[PDB]
Design a binder for this molecule. Structure first.
Ligand SMILES: [Mg+2]
Ligand SMILES: [Mg+2]
Ligand SMILES: [Mg+2]
Ligand SMILES: [Mg+2]
Ligand SMILES: [Mg+2]
Ligand SMILES: [Mg+2]
Ligand SMILES: [Mg+2]
Ligand SMILES: [Mg+2]
Ligand SMILES: [Mg+2]
Ligand SMILES: [Mg+2]
Ligand SMILES: [Mg+2]
Ligand SMILES: [Mg+2]
Ligand SMILES: [Mg+2]
Ligand SMILES: [Mg+2]
Ligand SMILES: [Mg+2]
Ligand SMILES: [Mg+2]
Ligand SMILES: [Mg+2]
Ligand SMILES: [Mg+2]
Ligand SMILES: [Mg+2]
Ligand SMILES: [Mg+2]
Ligand SMILES: [Mg+2]
Ligand SMILES: [Mg+2]
Ligand SMILES: [Mg+2]
Ligand SMILES: [Mg+2]
Ligand SMILES: [Zn+2]
Lengths: 118, 86, 158, 122, 50, 203, 53
RNA sequence: CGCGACCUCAGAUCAGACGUGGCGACCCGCUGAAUUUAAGCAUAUUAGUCAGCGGAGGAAAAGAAACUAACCAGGAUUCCCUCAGUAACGGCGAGUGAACAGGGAAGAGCCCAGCGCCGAAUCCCCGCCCCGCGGCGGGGCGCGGGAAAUGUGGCGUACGGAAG
């Protein structure tokens, strides 16, 4: 066999994947950020309740590692209601105020007085 | 225009809070800390300032693992044993 | 600026001497430390002599001190081979050995050989196995009389 | 009633997880009651539910890891969270076998020439 | 600066929460020496660093 | 035994056989890099009498120390002080290039421990030393009792406390009347014992 | 081909052994035993091999 | 041309380990000033000191003579008293300045390479069985892999040693 290109490059060798004799950590770590510990409490301010009675949404305080997809999946599991969209912001306190706009078949006022805020 | 009117242009900052020592001494253009020497792997530490040593040594912060290893030394690092129950 | 009459003096304090000063306030604490460690050692090697092994008659080197005989390092190998003590068994039965010592003389060697023969007369060797005594072991009536001696074993007096 | 860690240990795992998420629901609705403005009974009960969750999770983690080191008790390579966590130099210390290994030179020397048991007549 | 970063904003959030006064039920405690909050910070006087 | 012939052959260095071998080896060692691992020692007999037993866990590095004295690392001339201390050009470093060799080999291999080192060639501008290293956590070393002394934490980085042979040759110690200024632990221990007042309690 | 540095090194070391005036004590290992004598000797040496474990 | 040995040298998220950084009073290696003193100052002095750099341990280092001596001779190292502000160095100016012997604290000695002789007699690692397992070790089994003759182990080291 002959060499066309006058540059010698490193030949491609075989490389195996890991077959370790023991796992590093023995147990997989429990998800400390789950659907209960992601949302903390809904706001009961006058702007919050005016927004739940006008825009058919809810207002929550969540921790800052939450995605919009995570907040959507969390509210869907915790209250069995479908979610149109999510708008998040970080308050000057350091909390993450989330805005969970519901699907139009649900009404935020009856959802609120069954989840306790009224 | 050496003093008061030259203090008006103070609006863009040199340092920022470092992410190893927490002090506002992480230079931005050099990108090295002046308090701990951040990209260097060794902590900046000089014997010509005993006060700058004393401000952050082993005793200063939490000793979050080291007070635990002190009270494990006072029983010789027992492991796997529990006191016998009721 | 010297005054009228007196010595002229050169005190060696021109360096920084206060930063390096050894002060002896742990002198009695260290005496009690040596004493407690010595007593713990003496009861640890429990019937054996407290002063350790036996060390030979040796006279001092120089012109100032050769009239005086003192304790040496260890019994020389020629001394041991004349006294019939094996050079590895001497350190087991409590005889200090050093191989470095020469012997240019005769009566110093004979004094050390007499001292080794007197030591092997004097020592009480317990059996290596307590229930089964052996050949070179002393008898059980002087096993009950064996005890430590304080002070050096056969002190070398001038 | 007042939950405690004695009677949770024979309790099997899915029972502990459903008691856990019941306590999670209860803590969340206590937080809702705190924000809406509830009673001092609810605000006192918040700490009780938090420590309830804490000792249920303690029992779950202990009963998991005891079974883990039972599973790895016989094997030669066991994981790092299961290995003994003494100090670093104390793990890098030679073990009591390799410090007790004696070469054959000094084995036969301490055979032939043992340190005897002697005393000197004064 | 309305173009804050997340680290600087969270730092300012902590300083803003620290700038609140002592709750009045504390100076009914037994061995109390705290008469007020001595480490308070007005935004004209002390410019906080950064 | 062959090692007697090998060590007398290495005693004859200016003879043509060894002069050919040394200049060819020195060419090759210059063509290689600065700190590369040799797979077996070049001088087996010297390696053995320094401590290398060809078992699993001893490695040989072949390192290049740039040859010469030591000029004072100061800007242009400019030592700011008395005319004694304008020494810049003709100063000499207190340790040997063999000790510098083994210390930078031991710094590059921090998990390993320097045993000794020896000489494999020299040029006008470099000298080449092979440094012996021991893997202190390999069990062929660790289960052998008369070489598990190296696996203790007191022997951590011997090359930089100056405890190998070429490190000891610069500490100025040894028995005798030639070495009065090191009795004690070392030279600094000698100085420290001499320049203290023993102020007693009762004086 | 721009060969790697070890291939270049192990070739031009052989070039230097062909260039330099090799002393007879090192030249003498090039004067080597020929083929049919060597295969005869190794056929004989196969009879007296030491044992495996 | 190909195949197969070895040698040099690469690539692996390969199997198992190890080092990194901190404190730094005490310890070891290097680097290393100037104030100051000399009634100035340049050699000296401050001073192998401060600052700088690297590396540890519970102590470090040193350590079992290529020694001291010149005697009727002592005998590893370390520390204390003394030698001694002595011998000696020094614009022989200012200043600097140890050791031997002696008395004590302590006390302990040893091992390789070589020269050799024993069929590599040596070592590491994986698989299986029994035991122990929070300092991965003890035993047996593998026509299991590897290191090693470019030298592992046993005897043997200047006090001699080996063999018959
Ligand atoms: Mg700038
Ligand atoms: Mg540093
Ligand atoms: Mg006057
Ligand atoms: Mg004594
Ligand atoms: Mg041996
Ligand atoms: Mg202002
Ligand atoms: Mg000068
Ligand atoms: Mg020399
Ligand atoms: Mg791997
Ligand atoms: Mg370090
Ligand atoms: Mg002056
Ligand atoms: Mg003056
Ligand atoms: Mg002046
Ligand atoms: Mg000096
Ligand atoms: Mg310093
Ligand atoms: Mg330590
Ligand atoms: Mg030591
Ligand atoms: Mg040592
Ligand atoms: Mg002495
Ligand atoms: Mg006097
Ligand atoms: Mg001086
Ligand atoms: Mg003396
Ligand atoms: Mg051999
Ligand atoms: Mg000797
Ligand atoms: Zn920093």
């Amino acid at each position: 066999k002959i060499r066309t290109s006058p540059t010698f490059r490193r030949p491609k060798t075989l490389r195996l994947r890991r077959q370790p004799k023991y796992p590093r950590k023995s147990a997989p770590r429990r998800n400390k950020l789950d659907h209960y510990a992601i949302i903390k409490f809904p706001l009961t301010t006058e702007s919050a309740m005016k927004k739940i009675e006008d825009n058919n949404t809810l207002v929550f305080i969540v921790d800052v590692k939450a995605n919009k997809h995570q907040i959507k999946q969390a509210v869907k599991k915790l209250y069995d209601i479908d979610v149109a969209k999510v708008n998040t912001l970080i308050r000057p306190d350091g909390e993450k105020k989330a805005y969970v706009r519901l699907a139009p078949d649900y009404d935020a006022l009856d959802v609120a007085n069954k989840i306790g805020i009224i | 225009t050496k003093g008061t009117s030259s203090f008006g242009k103070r609006r863009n900052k040199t340092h920022t809070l470092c992410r190893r020592c927490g002090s506002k001494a992480y230079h931005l253009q050099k990108s090295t800390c002046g308090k701990c020497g951040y990209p260097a792997k060794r902590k900046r530490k000089y014997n010509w300032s005993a006060k700058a040593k004393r401000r952050n040594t082993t005793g200063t912060g939490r000793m979050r693992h080291l007070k635990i290893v002190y009270r494990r030394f006072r029983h010789g690092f027992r492991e796997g044993t529990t006191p016998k129950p009721k | 600026a010297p005054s009228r009459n007196g010595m002229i003096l050169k005190p060696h304090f021109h360096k920084d001497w206060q930063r390096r000063v050894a002060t002896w306030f742990n002198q009695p604490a260290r005496k009690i430390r040596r004493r407690k460690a010595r007593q713990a050692r003496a009861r640890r090697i429990a019937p054996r002599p407290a002063a350790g092994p036996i060390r030979p008659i040796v006279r001092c080197p120089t012109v100032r001190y050769h009239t005086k005989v003192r304790a040496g390092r260890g019994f020389s190998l020629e001394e041991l081979r004349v006294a019939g003590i094996h050079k590895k068994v001497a350190r087991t039965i409590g005889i200090s050995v050093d191989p470095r010592r020469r012997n240019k003389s005769t009566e110093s060697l004979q004094a050390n050989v007499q001292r080794l023969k007197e030591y092997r007369s004097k020592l009480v060797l317990f059996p290596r196995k307590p229930s089964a005594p052996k050949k070179g072991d002393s008898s059980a009536e002087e096993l009950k009389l064996a005890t430590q001696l304080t002070g050096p074993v056969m002190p070398i007096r001038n | 009633a007042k939950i405690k860690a004695r009677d949770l240990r024979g309790k099997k795992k899915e029972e502990l997880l459903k008691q856990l998420d019941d306590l999670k629901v209860e803590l969340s609705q206590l937080r809702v009651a705190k924000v809406t403005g509830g009673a001092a009974s609810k605000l006192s009960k918040i700490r009780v539910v938090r420590k309830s969750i804490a000792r249920v999770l303690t029992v779950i983690n202990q009963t998991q890891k005891e079974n883990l080191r039972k599973f790895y008790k016989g094997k030669k390579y066991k994981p790092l969270d299961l290995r003994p966590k003494k100090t670093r130099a104390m793990r890098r210390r030679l073990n009591k076998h390799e410090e007790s290994l004696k070469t054959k030179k000094q084995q036969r020397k301490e055979r032939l020439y043992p340190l005897r048991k002697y005393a000197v007549k004064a | 600066s309305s173009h804050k970063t997340f680290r600087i904003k969270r730092f300012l959030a902590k300083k803003q929460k620290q700038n609140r006064p002592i709750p009045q039920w504390i100076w009914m405690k037994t061995g109390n020496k705290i008469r007020y909050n001595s480490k308070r910070r007005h935004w004209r006087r002390t410019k906080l660093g950064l | 035994g062959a090692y007697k012939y090998i060590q007398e052959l290495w005693r004859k260095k200016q003879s043509d056989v060894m002069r050919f071998l040394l200049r060819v080896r020195c060419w090759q060692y210059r063509q290689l890099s600065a700190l590369h691992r040799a797979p077996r020692p070049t001088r087996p007999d010297k390696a053995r009498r320094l401590g290398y037993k060809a078992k699993q866990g001893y490695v040989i590095y072949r390192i290049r120390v740039r040859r010469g004295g030591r000029k004072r690392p100061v800007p242009k001339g400019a030592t700011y002080g008395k005319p004694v201390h304008h020494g810049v050009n003709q100063l000499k470093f207190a340790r040997s290039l063999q000790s510098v060799a083994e210390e930078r080999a031991g710094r590059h291999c921090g998990a390993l421990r320097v045993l000794n080192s020896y000489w494999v060639g020299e040029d006008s501008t470099y000298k080449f030393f092979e440094v012996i290293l021991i893997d202190p956590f390999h069990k062929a070393i660790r289960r052998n009792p008369d070489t598990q002394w190296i696996t203790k934490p007191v022997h951590k980085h011997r090359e930089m406390r100056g405890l190998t042979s070429a490190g000891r040759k610069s500490r100025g110690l040894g028995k005798g009347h030639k070495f009065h200024h090191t009795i004690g632990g070392s030279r600094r221990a000698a100085w420290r014992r001499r320049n203290t007042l023993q102020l007693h309690r009762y004086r | 081909v721009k060969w790697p540095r070890y291939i270049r090194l192990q070739r031009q070391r052989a070039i230097l052994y062909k260039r330099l005036k090799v002393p007879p004590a090192i030249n003498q290992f090039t004067q080597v035993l020929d083929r049919q004598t060597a295969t005869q000797l190794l056929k004989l040496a196969h009879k007296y091999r030491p044992e495996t474990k």
